[PDB]
Design a protein around this ligand. Structure first.
Ligand SMILES: [Mg+2]
Ligand SMILES: [Mg+2]
Ligand SMILES: [Mg+2]
Ligand SMILES: [Mg+2]
Lengths: 34, 452, 34, 55, 249, 290, 49, 49
RNA sequence: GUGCUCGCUUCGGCAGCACAUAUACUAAAAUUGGAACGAUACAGAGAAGAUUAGCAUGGCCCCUGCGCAAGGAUGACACGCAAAUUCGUGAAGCGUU
């Protein structure tokens, strides 16, 4: 190993912005898989 | 950003330091009183005197010297004058010194934990006493009536902290099984009954590479990674002798001859096989016509001959303590052989060749490679899969690093079973000679299985 | 995170501002003029 | 932030000429709503220059 | 699916990252990265992706669109509504935003919400076709009180005679003829003298022809002609044809 | 780099004497979290007790709300893995080099818009400090922290400086203990802290009230009442916590029994009350009756 | 206006109302609306700046 | 009540830390609202012009 | 510890006064982790047929240089090219018959 941006992809959402929330019920919302 | 003066803070700090109690400093808008905080009753009984303000103390002033003549050539301790009640050399206890040398080894200290509450059984007898509560004689000579393939797990030994590198069957009984783990532990499990770990041996500075049980079964010669091996007993568990040529041994085999059972042959990576007597302790003979890493050497023809393998593809049959490799084999196509096991008939050396398959040779006849006995289907390149033979010469057991326990019908050259043995490299797949279904597996997985 | 590198051109130079004097054209006379 | 010295004088003149073009019309007198083909008006501009030079 | 697949993912991800690293302008790479993600079904990834792309260019209708399309196809319906309102907050004068917001709200059933978002929308006095779809929405329901409230607001933000006309159109069809009369009165007295002209009046005469009141049809006809700017010439021939009509029928 | 007013650490790390002495160096060293230069304030912990120093960026601190020297939370004081889970907290802090640097940069930008009073983000919307955290919280200042290391000389014998061995000349811990090698970065990231797993085992084995089998056992026996209690006081213990159906205050055995009107209300009152429902000082035992 | 000013201080002016789009009318060159700060405030802000 | 003292900086001490670290630029601001006039789509004729 | 008490008061001490006032990345360590442009080997050089000069643009690439100068194969990498767009697919929505 020496891979300085290689694992930014399989590991984490590389540079993350959380979708801003507005006026609605977002917590209990969630999604099914593949 | 309060503003205070300092000389009084320094007097307060001197007090709070050397008398242990302090004038409480809280400047609360709730008007508290001047109170001694810290060692309250100390300040109370001492009348509050600060470390700076003069007050009477009959405390014994520590015993000091006084040589104040600067005319002395070797004299003036002067302002630096030692306190006379002080020691000369601050040496910490011999106990912690010996323990510190041992720990500097630990990062090898011969260290043994018997997990059995009573080390000897209900007769005062060490578990080196072969059972009579066995349902079949674990001291018999004959092959099993019919050994077959396994279909269910029996017992799993947990108690090794990493990948295991060997499991040694106690000779002729299979009542004890030493399990060597990368965590440097050689832990003997009672192979029957409770299946629980019996003994825990340690003493290496690195991985536990191999152990070989003595033809008396009371001894075992254990080679490791840090250039030294231990000739250890079982019940005391410690090494009676130390083997060391300062070389990297890979495997070791104990000669079964009762008048030569002190003769241990330990392969070294430097072209070498050492023939050394435990009793004397030095190398008695050399076998230095290998090319490099000698992976393993085994007994043949009443154990007076030694078979050897190399990663240099040099395979050898040369007599015990006769240092001339008088039977040499290195084909163009034959690849590295990690492991070689003699069929319990003594007719064949079945060596797992690292070409992902196992090759059988006639060990009694002219170094003949039987291509009608070529076991297919493993992946052994890079792994030393320990493959074995059941007692009836009908069944062979084989490991793969892919989690595959293969149970083959060694006659039909084909496997009848292929199942999950381990998760990590399935190293030792040993068929029990006195049990019909028993396939005991060690591996890099740290769990030690019996299947039946 | 202020570096210690430096430059020949950033040496101090021209450290006084010439202010526009009385006779040249000070903002005062500009306040007046027709 | 390197200066413009003597070897980047022509290169720099063209950086800035073709920047100015791209500001100038192909994004401030469009109404070619789609995607204003600025990459192709710049190709005209370079062929207009070659044709001026060759008469 | 342990590592052959996973490393195929690693590759395609690193590619898309390098393409958007090079440009990070024109968006096709942003989209294709994100839709590849959605097809692999990691909507948290795809979500952050659309937020970053929206950062670099928050004036992209297609970006907003396909962002919310992901949210709707995956029915994080709350998330989707947040998306839509943020959109219509930052790019109000885009219409398809408002549209898709409503349509999704409708098949959601929260028609109270749809009404209020249309109130929002009309605060901008958007557009004729916008009003008209508002009204078709309201008359997917009974709500004729609503419909005439909206024709009220629409014709009175937009001084059009034919807007007047469509108001009375709906009055005639949904059978409120007295209201049609009031609206013809209101219309002609607002438009009135100067720039009021033929066609509102021909519609009035025709509705009263439906009423078969011939003498007042005559009086409204000639009285409007005479009171307001009269005629021009081709329209006067049209007045002659309509005159034969009104006299005969 | 950052600029500070003073450190952030617990009382244990903070000290005992009323007048504390700490020296400041601006841009002294690198926060192993923010990775960049920080200020370093160095505090004299105790008499012959190891001088400590500030060991994380103040923003790297306000991030998770822990001790910039003691490393444990500032409200409770348990491993950050623990405290987070005791709030059921789930932080998305990025890990890789470029990802972490970008995260730290925008983090400092977002924290610049703060007023310096309390940690940022979910650190407030998780402020329901559960009695689990309250109970795992240490009580007194475990001031063994400011004792020095194992004077490797004094472990082999060598520490010939007299009593001035720079380190506690005791028996060195067998590093076979999981409580030995916890990489500071991992302890900060909440990454496999064996001491935290020990706190998990402890707060899992620590006594809590047990659930019964059948739903129709809505009678709850509270053992150890005493004769300073009232039926209305047992009520006011378990009354607005739901509805109670009845209560038997057994004075011939010093206990109680609340028959409830809501099962989950009974659960709330009793499970929260296990051995700690201390009204007028008597250790009652909340269970479901026979 | 909250969704607009989302995560922003009460300093930000965020025009999103139509009543900002609508053309105001002014006809007085002598209104308060059309008058700059007087030079006292100006010299104060000069000194602070 | 606490005494802060400023620890000496050694004069002959080189810089201590690798300053030149590159990362992308942080996310901008809360986007403004586009307060535009009603925009007109062009005829296909115009478009071909 | 240094002096002086008209201190006991002998030239022993005891005492009082004064004076003198807070060091220090505590460690000789023990750790723990990455590079050496070095070998090893693979590799293996812009545009148009060949042979070649360059100067730039972009950026989570740097190196040598005091350098905002200059050089490092034009220093390297930039490579699908999307793109709409030409005909049709469909869905949504408004209006006429
Ligand atoms: Mg060429
Ligand atoms: Mg150059
Ligand atoms: Mg050159
Ligand atoms: Mg270049």
């Amino acid at each position: 190993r020496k891979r300085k941006r290689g694992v930014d992809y399989n590991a984490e959402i590389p540079f993350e912005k959380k979708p801003a929330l507005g006026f609605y019920d977002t917590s209990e919302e969630n999604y099914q898989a593949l | 950003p309060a503003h205070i003066n300092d000389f009084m803070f320094e007097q307060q700090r001197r007090t709070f330091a050397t008398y242990g109690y302090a004038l409480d400093p809280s400047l609360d808008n709730h008007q508290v009183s001047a109170k001694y905080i810290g060692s309250v009753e100390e300040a109370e009984k001492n009348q509050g005197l600060t470390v700076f303000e003069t007050g009477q103390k009959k405390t014994e002033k520590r015993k000091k010297f006084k040589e104040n003549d600067a005319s002395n050539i070797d004299g003036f301790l002067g302002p630096w004058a030692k306190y006379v009640d002080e020691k000369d050399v601050a040496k910490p206890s011999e106990e912690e010194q010996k323990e510190l040398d041992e720990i500097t080894a630990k990062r090898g200290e011969e260290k043994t934990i018997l997990h059995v509450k009573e080390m000897y059984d209900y007769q005062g007898r060490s578990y080196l006493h072969i059972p009579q509560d066995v349902g079949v004689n674990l001291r018999s000579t004959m092959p099993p009536e019919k050994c077959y393939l396994p279909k269910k797990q029996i017992h799993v030994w947990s108690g090794h902290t990493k990948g295991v590198s060997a499991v040694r069957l106690f000779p002729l009984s299979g009542h004890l099984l030493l399990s060597c783990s990368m965590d440097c532990k050689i832990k003997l499990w009672e192979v029957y009954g409770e299946r629980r770990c019996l003994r825990t041996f340690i003493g290496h500075s690195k991985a536990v590479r191999d152990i070989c049980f003595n033809t008396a079964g009371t001894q075992f010669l254990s080679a490791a990674y840090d250039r030294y091996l231990k000739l250890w007993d079982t019940e005391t568990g410690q090494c009676i002798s130390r083997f060391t040529n300062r070389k990297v041994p890979y495997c070791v085999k104990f000669n079964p001859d009762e008048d030569k059972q002190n003769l241990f042959v330990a392969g070294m990576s430097d072209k070498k096989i050492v023939q050394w007597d435990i009793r004397s302790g030095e190398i008695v003979q050399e076998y230095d016509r290998h090319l490099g890493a000698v992976n393993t050497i085994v007994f043949v023809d009443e154990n007076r001959r030694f078979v050897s393998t190399s990663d240099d593809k040099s395979l050898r049959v040369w007599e015990w303590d006769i240092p001339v490799d008088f039977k040499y084999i290195a084909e163009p196509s034959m690849h590295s052989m990690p492991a070689v096991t003699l069929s319990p008939n003594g007719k064949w050396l079945a060596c797992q060749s690292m070409d992902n398959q196992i090759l059988i040779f006639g060990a009694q006849n002219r170094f003949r490679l039987n291509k009608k006995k070529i076991f297919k289907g493993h992946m052994v390149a890079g792994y030393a899969c320990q493959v074995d033979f059941s007692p009836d010469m009908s069944y062979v057991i084989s490991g793969d690093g892919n989690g595959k326990l293969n149970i083959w019908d060694w006659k039909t050259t084909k496997l009848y079973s292929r199942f999950k043995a381990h998760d990590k490299v399935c190293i030792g797949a040993v068929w029990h000679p006195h049990e019909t279904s028993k396939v005991i597996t060690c591996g890099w997985d740290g769990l030690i299985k019996l299947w039946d | 995170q202020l570096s210690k590198q430096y430059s020949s051109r950033d040496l101090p130079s021209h450290t006084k501002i010439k202010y526009r004097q009385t006779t040249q054209d000070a903002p005062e006379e500009v306040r007046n003029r027709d | 932030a390197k200066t413009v010295t003597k070897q980047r004088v022509e290169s720099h003149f063209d950086l800035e000429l073709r920047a100015a073009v791209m500001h100038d019309i192909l994004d401030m007198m469009p109404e070619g709503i789609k995607q204003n083909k600025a990459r192709t008006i710049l190709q005209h501009l370079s062929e207009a220059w070659r044709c001026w030079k060759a008469n | 699916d342990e590592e052959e697949l996973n490393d195929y993912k690693l590759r395609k991800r690193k590619t898309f990252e390098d393409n958007i690293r090079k440009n990070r302008t024109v968006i096709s790479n942003w989209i294709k990265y994100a839709q590849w993600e959605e097809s692999l079904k990691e909507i948290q990834r795809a979500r952050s992706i659309y937020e970053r792309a929206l950062d670099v260019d928050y004036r992209n209708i297609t970006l907003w669109l396909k962002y919310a399309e992901m949210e709707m196809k995956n029915r994080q319906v709350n998330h989707a509504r947040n998306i839509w309102d943020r959109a219509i907050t930052t790019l109000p004068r885009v219409n398809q935003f408002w549209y898709k917001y409503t349509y999704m709200e409708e098949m959601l059933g929260n028609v109270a919400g749809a009404r209020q978002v249309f109130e929002r929308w009309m605060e901008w006095q958007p557009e004729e076709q916008a009003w008209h779809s508002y009204i078709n929405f309201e008359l997917r329901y009974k709500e004729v009180d609503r419909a005439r409230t909206i024709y009220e607001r629409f014709v009175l933000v937009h001084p059009d005679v034919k807007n007047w006309i469509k108001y009375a159109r709906f009055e005639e069809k949904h059978a409120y003829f007295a209201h049609a009369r009031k609206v013809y009165e209101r219309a002609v007295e607002f438009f009135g003298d100067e720039h009021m002209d033929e066609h509102l009046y021909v519609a009035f005469a025709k509705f009263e022809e439906n009423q078969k009141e011939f003498e007042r049809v005559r009086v409204i006809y000639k009285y409007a002609l005479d009171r307001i700017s009269k005629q021009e010439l081709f329209k006067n021939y049209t007045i002659f044809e309509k005159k034969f009509g009104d006299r005969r029928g | 780099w950052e600029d500070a007013d003073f450190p952030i650490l617990c009382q244990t790390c903070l000290g005992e004497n009323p007048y504390i002495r700490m020296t400041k160096e601006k841009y002294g060293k690198e926060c192993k979290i923010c990775a960049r230069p920080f200020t370093v304030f160095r505090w004299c912990p105790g008499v012959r007790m190891r001088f400590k120093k500030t060991e994380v960026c103040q923003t790297c601190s306000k991030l998770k709300n822990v001790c910039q020297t003691c490393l444990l939370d500032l409200e409770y004081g348990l491993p950050i893995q623990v405290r987070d889970a005791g709030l059921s907290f789930k932080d998305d802090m990025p890990k890789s080099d470029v990802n972490k640097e970008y995260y730290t940069q925008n983090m400092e930008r977002e924290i610049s818009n703060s007023d310096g009073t309390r940690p940022v983000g979910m650190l407030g919307k998780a402020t329901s400090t559960s009695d689990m955290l309250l109970k795992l919280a240490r009580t007194t200042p475990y001031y063994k922290r400011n004792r020095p290391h194992i004077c490797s000389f004094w472990v082999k014998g060598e520490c010939k400086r007299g009593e001035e061995c720079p380190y506690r000349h005791e028996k060195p811990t067998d590093p076979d203990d999981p409580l030995a090698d916890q990489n500071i970065k991992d302890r900060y990231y909440g990454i496999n802290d064996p001491v935290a797993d020990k706190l998990l085992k402890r707060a899992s084995t620590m006594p809590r009230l047990d659930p019964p089998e059948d739903k129709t056992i809505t009678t709850l026996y509270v053992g150890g009442l005493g004769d300073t209690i009232t039926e209305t006081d047992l009520r006011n213990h378990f009354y607005q916590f739901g509805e109670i159906r009845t209560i038997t205050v057994v004075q011939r055995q010093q206990c109680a029994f609340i028959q409830f009107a809501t099962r989950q209300a009974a659960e709330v009152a009793a499970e929260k009350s296990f051995n700690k429902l201390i009204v007028n000082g008597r250790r009652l035992n909340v269970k479901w009756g026979r | 206006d909250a969704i607009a000013r989302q995560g922003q201080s009460k300093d930000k002016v965020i025009y999103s109302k139509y009543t900002d789009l609508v053309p105001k009318e002014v006809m007085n060159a002598d209104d308060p609306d059309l008058q700059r700060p007087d030079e006292e405030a100006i010299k104060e802000i000069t000194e602070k700046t | 009540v606490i005494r802060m003292v400023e620890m000496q900086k050694d004069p002959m001490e080189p810089p201590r830390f690798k300053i030149n670290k590159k990362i992308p630029r942080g996310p901008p601001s809360p986007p403004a609202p586009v307060m535009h006039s009603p925009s007109r789509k062009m005829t296909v004729k115009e478009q071909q012009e």
